[PDB]
Enzyme design. Sequence first.
Site, mmCIF file in Angstrom:
data_model
loop_
_atom_site.group_PDB
_atom_site.id
_atom_site.type_symbol
_atom_site.label_atom_id
_atom_site.label_comp_id
_atom_site.label_asym_id
_atom_site.label_seq_id
_atom_site.Cartn_x
_atom_site.Cartn_y
_atom_site.Cartn_z
ATOM 1 N N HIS A 69 0.488 -1.163 -0.522
ATOM 2 C CA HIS A 69 -0.502 -0.179 -0.141
ATOM 3 C C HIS A 69 1.081 1.422 0.221
ATOM 4 C CE1 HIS A 69 0.329 -0.023 4.628
ATOM 5 N NE2 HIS A 69 0.106 1.130 4.562
ATOM 6 N N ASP A 93 -0.482 -7.869 1.277
ATOM 7 C CA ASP A 93 0.220 -6.103 1.323
ATOM 8 C C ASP A 93 1.558 -6.190 1.152
ATOM 9 O OD1 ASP A 93 -0.392 -3.688 1.981
ATOM 10 O OD2 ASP A 93 -0.143 -3.349 3.908
ATOM 11 N N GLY A 149 5.018 6.512 9.188
ATOM 12 C CA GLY A 149 5.820 6.723 8.993
ATOM 13 C C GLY A 149 7.145 5.583 8.881
ATOM 14 N N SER A 151 5.435 2.105 8.798
ATOM 15 C CA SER A 151 4.568 1.399 7.709
ATOM 16 C C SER A 151 5.479 0.409 7.354
ATOM 17 C CB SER A 151 4.284 1.345 7.128
ATOM 18 O OG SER A 151 2.412 1.833 7.900
HETATM 19 C C1 LIG Z 1 2.121 2.632 7.350
HETATM 20 O O1 LIG Z 1 1.645 3.123 5.449
HETATM 21 C C2 LIG Z 1 3.005 3.825 6.709
HETATM 22 O O2 LIG Z 1 3.728 4.491 7.610
HETATM 23 N N1 LIG Z 1 2.872 5.276 5.804
HETATM 24 C C3 LIG Z 1 3.629 6.574 5.570
HETATM 25 C C4 LIG Z 1 3.416 7.456 6.565
HETATM 26 C C5 LIG Z 1 2.865 7.946 5.562
HETATM 27 C C6 LIG Z 1 0.529 3.514 7.976
HETATM 28 C C7 LIG Z 1 1.421 3.595 9.522
HETATM 29 C C8 LIG Z 1 0.154 3.973 10.754
HETATM 30 C C9 LIG Z 1 0.001 4.125 11.195
HETATM 31 N N2 LIG Z 1 -0.116 2.711 7.812
HETATM 32 C C10 LIG Z 1 -1.472 2.732 7.110
HETATM 33 O O3 LIG Z 1 -1.588 4.069 6.815
HETATM 34 C C11 LIG Z 1 -2.370 2.242 7.036
HETATM 35 C C12 LIG Z 1 -3.088 1.329 5.561
HETATM 36 C C13 LIG Z 1 -2.658 0.199 5.467
HETATM 37 C C14 LIG Z 1 -4.410 -0.458 6.142
HETATM 38 C C15 LIG Z 1 -5.146 0.392 5.613
HETATM 39 C C16 LIG Z 1 -4.405 1.638 5.605
HETATM 40 C C17 LIG Z 1 -4.701 3.102 7.160
HETATM 41 N N3 LIG Z 1 -3.117 2.306 7.760
HETATM 42 C C18 LIG Z 1 -4.094 2.125 9.052
HETATM 43 O O4 LIG Z 1 -3.196 2.327 9.715
HETATM 44 C C19 LIG Z 1 -5.383 2.993 9.761
HETATM 45 N N4 LIG Z 1 -6.099 1.982 10.831
HETATM 46 C C20 LIG Z 1 -7.225 1.650 10.304
HETATM 47 O O5 LIG Z 1 -7.876 1.408 8.993
HETATM 48 C C21 LIG Z 1 -7.843 0.472 11.016
HETATM 49 N N5 LIG Z 1 -9.145 0.443 11.483
HETATM 50 C C22 LIG Z 1 -8.841 0.892 13.037
HETATM 51 O O6 LIG Z 1 -8.401 1.618 13.352
HETATM 52 C C23 LIG Z 1 -10.226 1.387 12.945
HETATM 53 C C24 LIG Z 1 -12.003 1.077 12.153
HETATM 54 N N6 LIG Z 1 -12.910 1.641 12.421
HETATM 55 C C25 LIG Z 1 -13.383 1.362 13.881
HETATM 56 C C26 LIG Z 1 -11.848 1.904 14.599
HETATM 57 N N7 LIG Z 1 -10.792 1.384 14.505
HETATM 58 C C27 LIG Z 1 -7.791 -0.708 10.522
HETATM 59 C C28 LIG Z 1 -8.419 -2.209 11.146
HETATM 60 C C29 LIG Z 1 -7.839 -3.516 10.022
HETATM 61 C C30 LIG Z 1 -6.517 -3.402 9.763
HETATM 62 C C31 LIG Z 1 -6.057 -2.721 8.899
HETATM 63 C C32 LIG Z 1 -5.596 -1.452 10.231
HETATM 64 C C33 LIG Z 1 -5.383 4.619 10.433
HETATM 65 C C34 LIG Z 1 -6.990 4.659 11.010
HETATM 66 C C35 LIG Z 1 -4.484 5.376 10.065
HETATM 67 C C36 LIG Z 1 -4.456 3.603 12.076
#
Ligand SMILES: *[C@](O)(C(=O)NC1CC1)[C@H](CCC)NC(=O)[C@@H]1[C@H]2CCC[C@H]2CN1C(=O)[C@@H](NC(=O)[C@@H](NC(=O)c1cnccn1)C1CCCCC1)C(C)(C)C
EC number: 3.4.22.-
Length: 193
Positions: A69, A93, A149, A151
Amino acid sequence: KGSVVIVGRINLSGDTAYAQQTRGEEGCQETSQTGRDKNQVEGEVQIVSTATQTFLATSINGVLWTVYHGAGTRTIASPKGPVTQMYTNVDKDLVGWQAPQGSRSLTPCTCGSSDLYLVTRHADVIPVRRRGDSRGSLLSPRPISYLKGSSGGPLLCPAGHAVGIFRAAVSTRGVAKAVAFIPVESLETTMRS
Ligand SMILES: *[C@](O)(C(=O)NC1CC1)[C@H](CCC)NC(=O)[C@@H]1[C@H]2CCC[C@H]2CN1C(=O)[C@@H](NC(=O)[C@@H](NC(=O)c1cnccn1)C1CCCCC1)C(C)(C)C
Ligand SMILES: [Zn+2]
């Protein structure tokens, strides 16, 4: 398109983890478009950039792994020009290149410990408590900005072996409560049919 560009490195060899930035925003924008990067590589974990994002990538068993991703189908900029991906697994992924010259690879964890250590992009080492195949609790909750950052970075054994690759946080109102990861077993499955 464009190459992913190594803009840094995390060393996990010594007594304490530390980050070095080795390329800025202007020089990274330049190297993404050529695909040629003559910089010296070191460390287990690399800090990598696309045009929009900056995140981690981790060498295990001679392959630099990161998240799909973030990385997509992109080549990685190297000293011989742009390198094609060796592995692309969109379902898991997960993408992986031939580990770059200069780097060191982590060994898969064979101990099954539920005491994990998340290495962040700032070289903070955070204890995680393994919960199942792909999840772990944070012993302390953090703002998600703390993990933004990271991931592509590793979850480790207490023995310093790769348990998995961090990919996502479970977050409520900007507070990360748990981490999701790609288990090292999935990386092994990807190389082994
Ligand atoms: C990582 O890719 C990174 O370092 N990216 C560089 C900064 C630009 C990054 C690290 C974030 C802590 N990860 C993500 O952005 C991931 C990716 C991979 C899967 C989807 C997207 C979004 N994401 C997240 O970590 C998100 N988490 C979620 O969408 C989780 N859902 C919830 O937390 C949730 C949902 N509904 C209600 C309440 N909570 C899902 C849950 C299932 C597994 C996949 C993650 C965020 C919200 C950005 C933390
Ligand atoms: Zn282990």
